[PDB]
Design a protein around this motif. Structure first.
Motif, short mmCIF file in Angstrom:
data_model
loop_
_atom_site.label_atom_id
_atom_site.label_comp_id
_atom_site.label_asym_id
_atom_site.label_seq_id
_atom_site.Cartn_x
_atom_site.Cartn_y
_atom_site.Cartn_z
N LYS A 127 0.35 20.62 50.20
CA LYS A 127 -0.46 19.51 50.79
C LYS A 127 -1.57 20.04 51.70
CE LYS A 127 1.15 17.73 54.31
NZ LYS A 127 2.11 16.64 53.98
N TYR B 99 -2.64 24.05 45.11
CA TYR B 99 -1.69 24.41 44.06
C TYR B 99 -2.52 25.21 43.07
CZ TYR B 99 1.61 20.62 45.40
OH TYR B 99 2.49 19.81 46.09
N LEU C 96 4.80 21.45 37.64
CA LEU C 96 5.11 20.19 38.31
C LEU C 96 4.81 18.91 37.51
CD1 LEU C 96 3.73 20.96 41.91
CD2 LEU C 96 6.07 20.25 41.44
N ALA C 97 3.76 18.94 36.70
CA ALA C 97 3.37 17.76 35.92
C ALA C 97 3.81 17.85 34.47
CB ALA C 97 1.85 17.57 35.99
N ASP D 271 -2.21 18.29 46.34
CA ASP D 271 -1.05 17.48 45.95
C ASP D 271 -1.47 16.02 45.71
OD1 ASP D 271 2.13 17.19 45.92
OD2 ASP D 271 1.34 15.55 47.14
N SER D 272 -2.40 15.53 46.53
CA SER D 272 -2.86 14.14 46.44
C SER D 272 -3.42 13.74 45.09
CB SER D 272 -3.93 13.86 47.49
OG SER D 272 -5.12 14.55 47.18
N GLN D 273 -4.07 14.67 44.40
CA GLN D 273 -4.67 14.36 43.11
C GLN D 273 -3.72 14.39 41.90
OE1 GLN D 273 -6.67 18.87 42.80
NE2 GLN D 273 -7.45 17.15 41.59
N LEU D 274 -2.49 14.85 42.10
CA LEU D 274 -1.57 14.89 40.98
C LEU D 274 -1.34 13.49 40.42
CD1 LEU D 274 1.11 17.32 42.29
CD2 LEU D 274 -0.77 17.88 40.75
N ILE D 275 -1.53 12.48 41.25
CA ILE D 275 -1.30 11.12 40.81
C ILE D 275 -2.22 10.70 39.64
CG2 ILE D 275 -2.60 9.24 41.91
CD1 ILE D 275 0.07 8.63 43.43
N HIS D 276 -3.36 11.35 39.52
CA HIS D 276 -4.29 11.02 38.45
C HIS D 276 -3.74 11.45 37.09
CE1 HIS D 276 -6.99 9.88 41.51
NE2 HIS D 276 -7.40 11.09 41.84
N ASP E 277 -0.78 10.86 36.13
CA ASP E 277 0.14 9.82 35.68
C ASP E 277 -0.53 8.95 34.60
OD1 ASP E 277 1.95 10.77 37.48
OD2 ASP E 277 1.91 9.01 38.81
N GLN F 243 -9.66 5.36 33.79
CA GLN F 243 -9.45 5.67 35.20
C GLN F 243 -10.40 4.91 36.11
OE1 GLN F 243 -9.12 10.00 34.94
NE2 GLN F 243 -11.35 10.20 34.78
#
Lengths: 276, 276
Positions: free
Chosen positions: A1, A5, A13-14, A46-51, A53, A72
DNA sequence: GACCCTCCCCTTAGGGGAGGGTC
DNA sequence: GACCCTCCCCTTAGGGGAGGGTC
């Protein structure tokens, strides 16, 4: 964070390949937050991993990548509609498959039915289930005149409806005590229909009908110009002998036995004539 | 028949592109019977058009071209089996789609349900339908500690089963008269499950359970570190005021509002606590 | 004047190395 | 020694031309 990464860390992770990540970076679908100017290394927050999804879910249902770039952007209401669109396309693919599935099944019933024929050269009297067909006037066409090209129009109609192209080629002719094969000419040439889908816009020179359900004096054999006529002769005689009464044209079906450009060609013929 | 067809003639008769024909010629799937040595023109006999039947039917159901080359060789019994194989693969694709279709639908129910929320910032007491979830111990993790990477394992399990990746991220914590946000730590972190397919082999550090069906004092708002705690405070007070009795942890759900790498990020939070 | 031929470039979403640095 | 990067070649089934002969 509070650091980055590495591409490999994001990959684990993804559950997305490193090569996938670079590619999504290249098409500006999902780029890293920072690329070390000297080493070229890609770094993700870490915040951008949500994209990832929305990108994985879409990739799972099959939407194209450039298609995603438009997904998006849109908001939640718009995305809702998007899924409604995907639902339309899935139902489409389902219907296509269901039908396909049925067609395959029918192809197999007939494929096996002819596959386990009682015997060749013999005249068999059996109770037939109807066979829907599409026919057309056989303008002079005769046994020694027909060509595959003669079925071209019939085949294009059946093709748009069934997707599958007929296996067998049919012809019909008046029942007569034929002396020679040159003495005969086909009334109609036809091709069986599998699907029950409506033909786009059938022209009036095509007739949608059937070989009636009922009882027929049949005979199947392997094709040969000599045998075609000699076996017809057995039928003509079998009916004369039993003094039966014909109530239809003689139906002639020609099924290819292999479709291989290598082997010598051979077809299965099958002639039936309906009797009382 | 007693001459040849030019590639264009075959193209019109079989309803197959000229470029398709050349390509089938190149991969030795269907080559012309004669190629004029000087002009290079491709010439086809009427007799060989029949080989395009098996090629078009297969192309319609999707079998690969090199796959077809093995299909033209095999005999009628073997071809019968081949179709049985295709049937297996179609049923497979159907099942995949049916399920997909259902998953999409569920995603939409929840997507809309949150989309048409009564109001934000207000405490609403509503009767909830259960929501199956997969959770895992939240090892010390707290509101200011969680990371998307924290849900990595949970997400891989849900991903293998649902294909779709959760929209929302959940956490739970004991209901206490919290003074400060640092005073709180999550008991579990969880992700909702959509599909009802069995997870390959879930490890024992994952629990498959649910947010119980029942009555909850809820509140939804847009995320902000300050608001997360301030809204929790409304809930803590709303329950103290009405003197209600909590019978579950506080459930916290965080839904992303857009997934766009362009816009500033914003999430929807939703906290519910079950009451008698 | 239509027809037909041979390149040649292009399309999805990456997977496979290879040769050469880097955390 | 693991990691990561940049080419580079490759995959389906052809569709689109372009430049140049041919029925």
């Amino acid at each position: 964070k509070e650091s980055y990464y590495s591409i490999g860390e994001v990959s684990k992770l993804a559950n997305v390949s490193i090569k996938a990540l670079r590619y999504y970076d290249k098409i500006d679908l999902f780029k890293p937050a920072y690329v070390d100017p000297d080493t070229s290394y890609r770094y993700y927050t870490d915040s951008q991993l949500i994209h990832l999804d929305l990108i994985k879910s879409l990739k799972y249902i099959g939407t194209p990548l450039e298609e995603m770039k438009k997904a998006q952007d849109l908001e939640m209401e718009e995305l809702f509609a998007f899924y409604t669109e995907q639902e339309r396309q899935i139902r489409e693919k389902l219907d296509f498959l269901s039908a396909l599935e049925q067609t395959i099944s029918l192809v197999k019933k007939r494929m096996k039915r002819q596959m386990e024929y009682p015997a060749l050269g013999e005249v068999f009297v059996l109770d037939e289930e109807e066979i829907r067909i599409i026919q057309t006037e056989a303008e002079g066409i005769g046994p020694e005149n027909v060509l595959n090209a003669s079925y071209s129009k019939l085949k294009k109609f059946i093709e748009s409806a069934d997707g599958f192209t007929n296996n067998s080629y049919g012809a019909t002719f008046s029942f007569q005590p034929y002396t020679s094969i040159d003495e005969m000419t086909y009334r109609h040439i036809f091709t069986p229909v599998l699907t029950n889908k409506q033909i786009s816009s059938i022209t009036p020179d095509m007739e949608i009908t059937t070989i009636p359900k009922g009882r027929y004096a049949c005979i199947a054999y392997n094709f040969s110009p000599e045998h075609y006529f000699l076996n017809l002769q057995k039928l003509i005689k079998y009916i004369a002998d039993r003094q039966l009464t014909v109530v239809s044209d003689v139906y002639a079906l020609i099924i290819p036995i292999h479709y291989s450009p290598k082997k010598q060609e051979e077809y299965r013929v099958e002639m039936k004539i309906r009797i009382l």
